[PDB]
Amino acid sequence: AATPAAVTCQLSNWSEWTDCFPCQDKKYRHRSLLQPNKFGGTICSGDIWDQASCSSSTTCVRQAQCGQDFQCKETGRCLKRHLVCNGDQDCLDGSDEDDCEDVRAIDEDCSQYEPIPGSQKAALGYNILTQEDAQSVYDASYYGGQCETVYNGEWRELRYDSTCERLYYGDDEKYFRKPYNFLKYHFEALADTGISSEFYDNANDLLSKVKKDKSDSFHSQDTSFLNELNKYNEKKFIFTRIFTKVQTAHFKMRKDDIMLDEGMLQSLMELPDQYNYGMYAKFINDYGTHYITSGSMGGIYEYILVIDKAKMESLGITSRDITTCFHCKKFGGGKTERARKAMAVEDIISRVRGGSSGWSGGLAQNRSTITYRSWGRSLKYNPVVIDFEMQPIHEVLRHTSLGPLEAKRQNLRRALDQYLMEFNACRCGPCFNNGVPILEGTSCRCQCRLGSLGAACEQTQTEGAKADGSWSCWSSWSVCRAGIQERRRECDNPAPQNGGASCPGRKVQTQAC
Amino acid sequence: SHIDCRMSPWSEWSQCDPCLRQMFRSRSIEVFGQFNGKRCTDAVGDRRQCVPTEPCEDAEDDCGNDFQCSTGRCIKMRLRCNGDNDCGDFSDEDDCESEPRPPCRDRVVEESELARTAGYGINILGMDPLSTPFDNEFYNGLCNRDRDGNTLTYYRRPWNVASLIYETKGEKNFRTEHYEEQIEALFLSYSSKKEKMFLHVKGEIHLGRFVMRNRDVVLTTTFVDDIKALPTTYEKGEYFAFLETYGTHYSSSGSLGGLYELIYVLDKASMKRKGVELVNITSENLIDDVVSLIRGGTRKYAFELKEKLLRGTVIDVTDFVNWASSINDAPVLISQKLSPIYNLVPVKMKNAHLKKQNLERAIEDYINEFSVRKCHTCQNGGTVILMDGKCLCACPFKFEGIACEIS
Amino acid sequence: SHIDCRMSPWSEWSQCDPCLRQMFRSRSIEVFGQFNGKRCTDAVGDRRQCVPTEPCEDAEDDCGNDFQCSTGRCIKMRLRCNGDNDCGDFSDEDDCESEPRPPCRDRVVEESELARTAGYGINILGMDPLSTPFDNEFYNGLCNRDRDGNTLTYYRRPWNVASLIYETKGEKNFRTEHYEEEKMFLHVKGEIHLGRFVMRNRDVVLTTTFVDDIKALPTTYEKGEYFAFLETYGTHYSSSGSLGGLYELIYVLDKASMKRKGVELKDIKRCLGVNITSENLIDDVVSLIRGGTRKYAFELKEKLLRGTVIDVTDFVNWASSINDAPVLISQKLSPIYNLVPVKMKNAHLKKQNLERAIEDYINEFSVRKCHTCQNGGTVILMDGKCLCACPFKFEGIACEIS
C-alpha cells in the first residue's frame, strides 16, 4: 500500500474547572485526546491537562491531622515517633532531626554502609503503554530506622601497596544497607546460555534431451529435430539464535506497610475522593500504570542471524534442421529461451542489556571470549534489571501505611481502565512491514525496522515480505440493556499481509452490564 | 516566474503595556517564497518605546517567611547557610559566618554533567535541543548520591532530576538483501538484466535515561525573569522571541547515547524488449548511494570509527569499544519525551494562567506559520521542504530540480 | 565597445542635521560595467560639514541610579564589583576595586573562542569589519557554563548566548549515477557538525562601537551613510547556527571512454573501500572544502590531486583541526535593525531607515541592474563587476564562442 494520508491531532474542549481545592488553592481541568497525529499531521499545541491558581475562601487543617504520629511540615510523611531524632532524616524537611539535642535518641551507627547501588530503579513506577519508568512509587531511601544489610558477594577488588609487596583485596563494598521497601534483596551469580544453529540446503537439477534424425532418398531429404531442457534449483537456509542471561541479584518488594515516596504521597493526598478523570489520569501519567514487585538484576545478550538464499535457472531449446536435393537446398528453424534469478537476504540482530557502553557495544559487535569476559566484568559495576513482575498502580494503595483508601483506589482503577483505553497505541495508524506503533504524549510514530521505511514503514525496499497483521483496538462498550456489555475488535490494522500470520488475540470481549 | 516571498501589512500597534514601557506589532508571512525567490528574512514582529500611560503593578511580592535572594528566588529557611548556592547567587549562605550545616556529611561526592544538562529545551521545528530551563544546581539541600555506573564515581543528583539511571543498552542491526535476474524470453521477447543490493546497518548505544521531576521543580532565574518580561497581552512576536530563546517544548525525560548508521544501495539494470503487438524498448540504469552517519562520542574516536565503517576493513573491536566508552564523555540526546514549555510557567506567578494560554496560542502560531502547509505544491510529487524562509522541492523519484520540473 | 560604468548625479544635497552638523547626498550606480568594460568603484554616498542651523534637540540621556559606565553602557549595579569587565572598559572594576566577589567563584572555567566570535554580522553581499556587534565578554555576573566533551574543559557562556551545545555529528555520502536510453553524475559530501549556538533575542548587550555608530546615523534617510553602516556591521546577523566543517568533491566521467580506459568502478572503488595510468578523468576531481585549519585540508588536496584517496589519519587530523578554525555550516540570519536598542534616541525611525537602507542595498547591487549577455550566457555581479560565465565549453568574456 501507499502511505495513509496524514491526520491532524485533535483535542476536546476544556472540561469545567474543578472547584478550588482548599489546601492547594489550585483549579484543575482536562481535555480528551480525540485524535493523535497518526501520520505527518499538525501536532496539538496544548497539553491535555491544565491547572491554575485560586483562592479557596476556606481554610484547611490537614497539617495537624496525623499529629499523633510525627507529621512533617513539608510532606504528609507521618512517622512512628522513635524515628524522631533517630539520627537519620526520614522526611526531606529533616524536621524529625532538627533540634535533636537529646541525641541519645539515635538508633544505630549504620551509615558506614551505602544503600544498595541500583536499588532506585526498583522504586520507580512503570508505564505499560510505553515501557518507560515514571516517577518514584516506593521511597528508595527510607529505612524505617532499621540497619538491615545485604552481603555483596563481589566485594573483592584488587589493591596493591608499593610500601609493602602485597597484592590484596579491599573490602569497602562488602555490605550494603537494604532500604525498607525491599523484603528481599539477594545477590546470587547465575548464568545460562542457549545456542541453536541450523543449516538446510538443497540443490535439485534436471537435464533432458532428445535428438531425432531421419533421412530418406528416392532426390533426397534429411531432417534433424532437437528438444532440450535444463532446470536447476537451489535453496540455502541458515538460522542461529543465541541467548545469554546472567543473574547477579534478585529482589522482592515488601507487600506490607509500604512507605510511598514523598512525591507520590503528596500527589495522592491531592486527589479528590470524588471521581475526576483529569486528576487521576494526571496521577497515572506521572506515577505510571504499574509498579514493580519482583526483580532480577543481571545482564542479557541476544544474537540472531538468519540467511536465506535461492537460485533458479532454466534453459529450453527446440530446433529443426532440414536439407534436400532435387539444385540442393538447406533450411533451419527453431527457438530457445533462457532465464536466471538469484535472491539473498541476511538479517542479524544483536543486543546487550548490561553494564557499560563500551563493552555493551563491543559485545554487540563481536561475540568472543574477550568481549564476553570484559562485559561480564562490567556487569559487576552496573547490572541492569533483566526481569520484573509488576501489578497495577492502584494495588499499591491497599498496602500503604496510610491505611484504607477504598474510594481513591476505585477511582484510580476506573481512571486506569480509561487511561489504558485512551492512550493505547491502537490510535497510531497501521505500521506496515511489522513496524511497531508507538504513542507518546499526543503524537504517534512507527518504529520501522531496517527492511522498511516511510511514515508507516509502508515502503519496504524489496518488493514485499510476509508481514503479520495486528488488531485495531476494541470498539466502545455496547449500550447494554441485558446484563451483558460487549466489545469487538478485528485483525485489520493492518490485516495479515503477503501471507503473514493473523494476530492471535481475542475478537470478542464481554463485561457485566 | 519564481516567487519572492510576501508578508502581510503590520498589525495595528498594541496599547502601551505598562511597566515594560513598550508597544508591539505583528506581521505574518503570507507566502514563504520558493524556487530561489528571496527569503523572508524580515522580522515577524516589531516593538517600540512608549512613555507609560497609567500606573504599573509591581512584579515582586513579599514571599513572607521564605528568604528572598538578590536573584528573587525564595528558598525555605532550612537552606540558609546550607552552602549549596540554592539561589544561584550565594545569598543563601554568604550571610553566614558559621554553622554551615552542609549536606552529604563530608562524604566523597561530585557534580554530574549529565544531570546538570538534563531537561534540554527543544524547538519542535527541527527537534533541535536547547539549554535546560531547569537549574539542576539547586539540590534542595538533599544529597541523593548515585553511581556513574560506567565509572566508580558518586555524583549528587540535582533536585529536578527525579531519576537518572544508567540502564545501558547496546544494539546492532544489520541487513543485506541481494538480488539478480536475467530474462531472455503479445509477441514480446526480452533481455532484461538486474543486479540489486541493499545493505543497511545501525547500532544504537544507550548510556542512560533521565526523568525530570513532575512537581515542585525549580527553574533558572533567567527563564522566570523572561516570563516576567513576557507581555500579558499576547504580542505574537514577543512570545515567538521567548519560544526561540527556550524552544516550544522541554524534554521531561530523555535517553542519552550515541548512534552509528550506514546505508549502501546499488541498482544496476538494463531492459530490452522486442516483438509485435496484437516493439523497440531499450534502457539502462546505475544507482550507487553510500551514506554514513555517526552521532555522539568524542571526535577523535567517532570519526575513526565512521571511516573504518566506510572502509570494508574489519573493525578492530578496540576502536568500537573506544568510541562507545567515549559516548560517556559526549552523549547525544538520542531520544526524549516532550512536554510543552508552558507547563514550566510557574503557577501562582502573576497572570500565570494567562501567560500559559498565550504561550499555547503562540505555539499554535509558530507551528502554523513555519509550516509548509502555506507553500506551493511541488510539480511532480516531490517533497516540499521549508528550508529557511523559502521552500525547495526534492524528489526521491528520478525527477530532478528544485521543483522537480524535469527528470 | 564594452560597457563602462554608468552612474548618476550628486542629487538632493541635504540641509544639516543639527546635532551631527553634517549634510549628505545619496548618489547611485546605474550599470555595473560589462564585458570587461570599466567596472564600478566610485562612491555611492557623499557628505560635507555644517555650521549648525539651530539647537541640538537635547539628545543626551543618562543612567540615573544605574552605573554611568565610562563608555555609556548603563549596567545594573550588582555588576559594579563584578570583577568581570561588564563595563566595556573595566571602569566598573576600576570603580569597585575595594572588594572582589567573582562570579564562577570556585569553578575552573574558560571562555570559548566560538562564544567570543559567536553571532557574526554578515553582509548578504560580502563580509564586514567588527564582525560581531555582540559584546560576548559580558557575563551579567552569571556563571552559566557548558563542557566540551572532547577536553572536559568548562567554557562559560557569555550572556548573549541563550544556548551553546557541543556535538559531534559526522556524515559522509558517496553517490555515483549513470543512465542510458544518457547521463553521468557523481558527488561526494562530508559534514563534521561540531556544535550549535542560539542567541538571546532581547536585552542584547551591543558593543560600544555599535551604539556610537547608531549615534552616527542621521534621523533622516541619508542613504549613503546608512550604506556605510550596513557595510560596516552587516545587513544581517546569525541568530543561531551550526559550527563545524564541510567538504564536497565531484568527478564526472565520459562513460564511453570510462568503459575502456578502465573497465568498471570496482577498478577505482578498490582504492576507497592496482591502478591503470590511462583513466584520469575520475582522478582530476573538482574539490570544495569549507572550514578547517588549512594545513590539513591542503594535505588532503595534495593527496586527492594525485588521485589518492586520503588516509583516515589525514581525515581525523583535519577534523581535530576543525575546532581550531570552524565555519558556520548553517544559520538563521535576522536583520541588524532588530539589534537597535529600543531606548536609543529616536530608535524607531533609525530602524525604519535601516529597513530602507537594506532594501536599497538589494535593489542597487543586483544582476537585474545589468543587461543581457551577448548570446544567452549568464552574467554574474561577482565583486561588483557584471561579467559572464557559461558551463558547456563556451568561451569568451561573454561566451561569444560556441
Tell the burial category of A190 from Cβ atoms under 10 Å away from its Cβ (0-12, 13-18, 19+): exposed
Mutate to test the interface with C, among B49, B112, B125 (most CBs of C within 10 A): B49
Q: Could you tell me if A206 and A220 are in contact, meaning their C-beta atoms sit under 8 angstroms apart?
A: no
* CB C7 within 8 Å of CB C29: yes
Residue found under cell 556535538 = C167
CA dist., res. C3 & res. C370, Å (int): 10
Resolution in A: 3.3
How far apart (Å, rounded) are the C-alpha atoms in residues B146 and A114? 10
Three-class SS state of A280: helix
- The answer to whether A464 contacts chain B (CB < 8 Å) is no
What kind and span of H or E run contains A375?
A: helix A369-381
Q: Do the strands B22-26 and A78-79 form a parallel or antiparallel pair, or are they unpaired?
A: unpaired
d(CA B221, CA B239): 18
Q: Which residues pair with A204 in a beta bridge?
A: A233
At B45 the three-state DSSP class reads strand
For C298, other C-beta atoms within 10 Å of its C-beta total 12
Distance CA B332, CA C195 (A): 12
Q: CB–CB of B44/B240 below 8 Å?
A: yes
Beta bridge partners, C171, equal: B293, C191
DSSP string for A58-127: S---GGGTTTTSEE-SSS--EE-GGGTTSSS--STT-TTTTT---GGG-----TTSPBPTT-HHHHEEEE
Alpha-carbon distances of B205 from A71, A297, A352, B261, C349, rounded to whole Å: 45, 20, 9, 12, 55
For residue A455, give the H/E element and its range: none
Q: What are phi and psi of C251, to 5 degrees?
A: -160, 100
Whether C342 and B311 lie within 8 Å, measured CB to CB: no
Contacts of residue B119 in chain C, CB cutoff 8 Å? none
CA distance B380 to chain C (A): 20
Phi-psi region of A8 (alpha: psi -120 to 50; beta: other; left: phi over 0): beta
- List phi, psi (to 5°) of C301: -55, -40
Q: Residue A67, Cβ neighbours under 10 Å: how many?
A: 9
- Dihedral, CA of residue A418, residue A419, residue A425 and residue A427, to nearest 10: 50
Question: Would you say C92 and C75 are in contact if contact means Cβ atoms under 8 Å apart?
Answer: yes
Mutate to test the interface with C, among B288, B300, B308 (most CBs of C within 10 A): B288
Of chain B, the end-to-end C-alpha distance in Å amounts to 20
Is B222 an 8 Å CB contact of chain C?
A: yes
Q: How far is CA C17 from CA C47, C227, C355, in A?
A: 12, 18, 20
User: Which residue is it, cell 547490572?
Assistant: A383
Residue of A508, A510, A466, A511 whose CA lies nearest to A491 = A508
Which set of grid coordinates corresponds to residue B363?
505555539
d(CA A475, CA A507): 11
Residue A223 phi/psi, 5-degree rounding, is -140, 145
How is residue B190 written as a grid cell? 526480452
> Among residues A389, B301, B281, which one has the least CA distance to residue C150?
B301
Give the residue among C224, C243, C214, C223 at the shortest CA–CA distance from C336.
C214
Instruction: Give the HSE-up count for residue C222: Cα atoms under 13 Å, Cβ half-sphere.
Output: 23
DSSP for C329-390, written as a single string: EEEEEEEGGGGS-TTSTTHHHHHHHHHHHHHHHHHHSSGGGS---TTS-EEE-TTT--EEE-
- For C359, residues 6+ apart whose C-beta sits below 8 A from its C-beta are none
Crossing angle of helices A277-287 and A406-422, rounded to 10°: 80
Neighbours of C345 (CB within 10 A): 17
Of A355, A361, A450, the CB nearest to B324: A361
| Chain B contact present for A399, CB below 8 A | no
Among residues B398, B404, B401, which one has the least CA distance to residue B382? B404
Backbone angles phi, psi at B62, to 5 degrees: -60, 115
Distance CA C200, CA A13 (A): 35
**Contact yes or no for C2/C36 (Cβ under 8 A):** yes
Residue C181 is nearest to which of B117, B282, B287, comparing CB atoms? B282
Q: Which residues pair with A486 in a beta bridge?
A: A510
Q: Is the dihedral of CA B159, B163, B167, B168 positive or negative?
A: negative
Q: Identify the experimental approach.
A: cryo-EM
Which among A144, A132, A136 has a CA at the least distance from the CA of A119? A136
Q: Residue B72 — left, alpha, or beta (φ > 0 → left; ψ -120 to 50 → alpha)?
A: left
SS3 C77: helix
Q: Which of B168, B175, B265 sits opposite A357 (nearest CB)?
A: B168
Rounded Cα distance, B342 and A427, in Å: 26
Give dist(CA C249, CA C269) in Å, integer.
15
Q: Which amino acid is present at A239?
A: F
> In sequence order, what are the residues at sequence separation of 6 or more whose Cβ sits closer than 8 angstroms to the Cβ of residue A144?
A83, A90, A180, A259
Q: Which three cell numbers stand for residue A83?
A: 524515628
Q: For chain B, say whether A207 makes contact (Cβ under 8 Å).
A: no
3-state secondary structure of B224: helix
Q: Please name every residue paired with A78 in a beta bridge, in sequence order, or none if there are none.
A: A71
Helix (H, G, I), strand (E, B) or coil at C314: helix
Q: Which of B292, B298, B310 sits opposite C150 (nearest CB)?
A: B298
Q: What gap in Å lies between CA A374 and CA A356, rounded to an integer?
A: 9
Cβ neighbours of residue A149 closer than 8 Å, sequence gap 6 or more: A110, A113, A175, A176, A177, A178
**Cα-flanking dihedrals φ and ψ of residue B97, to 5°?**
-80, -25
Q: Which residues of B touch C365 (CB under 8 A)?
A: none
Mutate to test the interface with B, among A31, A45, A373 (most CBs of B within 10 A): A45
Instruction: Write down the residue that cell numbers 572502509 correspond to.
Output: B311
Distance from C-alpha of B345 to C-alpha of A447, rounded to nearest angstrom: 33
CA distances from C351 to B20, B22, B358, C214 (A): 20, 15, 28, 10
| Record: contact A361-B363, CB cut-off 8 A | no
- The C-alpha of B300 sits at a distance from chain C's nearest C-alpha, in angstroms, of 7
State the cell numbers at A297. Answer: 538484576
Rounded Cα gap, residues C387 and C36, in angstroms: 7
For residues B92 and B73, the answer to whether their CB atoms sit within 8 Å is no
Choose from B199, B287, B320 for mutation: most chain A CBs within 10 A: B320
Contacts of A366 (CB under 8 A, 6+ apart): B315, B317, B320
Bridge partners for B177 per DSSP: A345, B198
Chain A to chain B, count of Cβ pairs less than 8 Å apart? 225
Residue B90 DSSP class: G
Known binding residues of A for Ca(2+) are 83, 86, 88, 90, 96-97
Q: How is residue A18 written as a grid cell?
A: 474543578
Residues in C 90-119 with any Cβ partner in B closer than 8 A: 105
Give the containing element (helix H, strand E) for B280. Answer: strand B280-295
Q: C363: Cβ–Cβ under 8 A, 6 or more apart, which residues?
A: none
Pairing mode of beta strands B154-156, B110-111:
parallel
Count CB atoms within 10 A of the CB of residue A167: 9
Residue A61 contacts by C-beta under 8 Å, 6 or more apart in sequence? none
What is the rounded CA–CA span in Å between residue A26 and residue A269?
14
Task: Give the span between the Cα atoms of C21 and A340, in whole angstroms.
Answer: 90
Q: Say yes or no for a CB contact (<8 Å) between A263 and B213.
A: yes
Q: Which of A267, A263, A275 is nearest to A26 (CA)?
A: A267
Q: Which residues of B touch C173 (CB under 8 A)?
A: 289-292
Is B360's CB within 8 Å of A441's CB? no
Alpha-carbon span C264 to C201, nearest angstrom = 55
Residue written as cell 495486528? Answer: A470
Q: Does B330 touch chain C (CB under 8 A)?
A: yes
Question: Considering Cα of C242, then C247, then C253, then C255, what sign does the dihedral take?
Answer: negative
Chain B segment 180-219 residues within 8 A of C by beta carbon are none
284-313 of B, contacting C, C-beta below 8 A: 284-300, 302-304, 306-308, 310-313
CB distance C330 to C241 below 8 Å: yes
Could you tell me the CA-to-CA distances from A344 to A15, A165, A198, B175, B270 in Å, in that order?
Answer: 57, 61, 17, 11, 20
> What is the C-alpha to C-alpha distance for residues B394 and B383, in angstroms, rounded to an integer?
5
- Nearest by CB to residue A365, choosing from B145, B172, B183, is B172
Q: Nearest residue on chain B to C354, judged by CA atoms?
A: B42
Instruction: Give chain B's radius of gyration (CA, Å).
Output: 29
- Contact present, B365 and B44 (Cβ < 8 Å): no
Which residues have CB under 8 Å from A341's CB, separation 6+?
A310, A311, A312, A313, B180, B181, B182
Question: Residue C274 corresponds to which cell in the numbers above?
Answer: 592496482
Q: Does A467 touch chain B (CB under 8 A)?
A: no
- What distance in Å separates the CA atoms of residue A401 and residue B48, rounded to the nearest whole number? 60
Sign of the alpha-carbon torsion through B230, B236, B238, B243: positive
Backbone breaks in chain C (C–N > 2.5 Å) follow which residues? 181, 273
Terminus-to-terminus CA distance in chain C, angstroms? 21
> Helices marked H in B231-347 — which ranges?
236-246, 299-310, 317-326
Q: How many CB pairs under 8 A join B and C?
A: 147
Residue type, B214: N
- The answer to whether the CB atoms of B337 and A132 lie below 8 A apart is yes
**Residue C55: is the preceding peptide bond cis (ω within 30°)?**
no
Can you spell out the DSSP letters for B101-161?
A: --TTTT---EE-HHHHH-S-EEETTTTEEE--SB-----TT---EEE-SSSS-EEEPPTTE
Q: Which residues contact C277 (CB under 8 A, 6 or more apart)?
A: none
For chains C and B, tell me whether 3 or more CB atom pairs sit within 8 A of each other.
yes
What is the rounded CA–CA span in Å between residue C271 and residue C311?
A: 11
How far apart are alpha carbons C137 and B301 in whole angstroms? 33
Tell me the nearest-neighbour CA distance from B298 into chain C, angstroms.
5
Q: How far is CA A460 from the centre of its chain?
A: 24
Whole-number Å distance between alpha carbons of C366 and A42: 39
* Residue of chain C whose Cα is closest to the Cα of B301: C316
Rounded to 5°, angle at Cα C163 from C157 and C169: 110
Residue A288, amino acid? G
Find all residues with CB under 8 Å of A244, minimum gap 6, and list them. A191, A192, A193, A300, A301, A302, A372
**For cell 551577448, what's the residue?**
C374
* Contact: B295, C169; criterion CB under 8 Å: yes
Binding residues of A are 83, 86, 88, 90, 96-97
* CB-nearest partner of B175 from A43, A346, A371: A346
Measured CA to CA in angstroms, residue C154 lies from A447, C104, C143 at distances of: 37, 11, 11
β-pair type (C161-180, C183-199)? antiparallel
Contacting chains of B (3 CB pairs or more, <8 Å) are A, C
Q: Which stretches of C191-304 are DSSP H helices?
A: 208-215, 223-232, 255-261, 266-269, 294-304
Q: Do B171 and A349 touch (CB under 8 A)?
A: yes
Instruction: Kindly calculate the radius of gyration of chain C based on its CA atoms and give it in whole angstroms.
Output: 27
B366 C-beta neighbours (distance < 10 Å), count: 22
| Interchain CB distance below 8 Å, C167 and B332 | yes
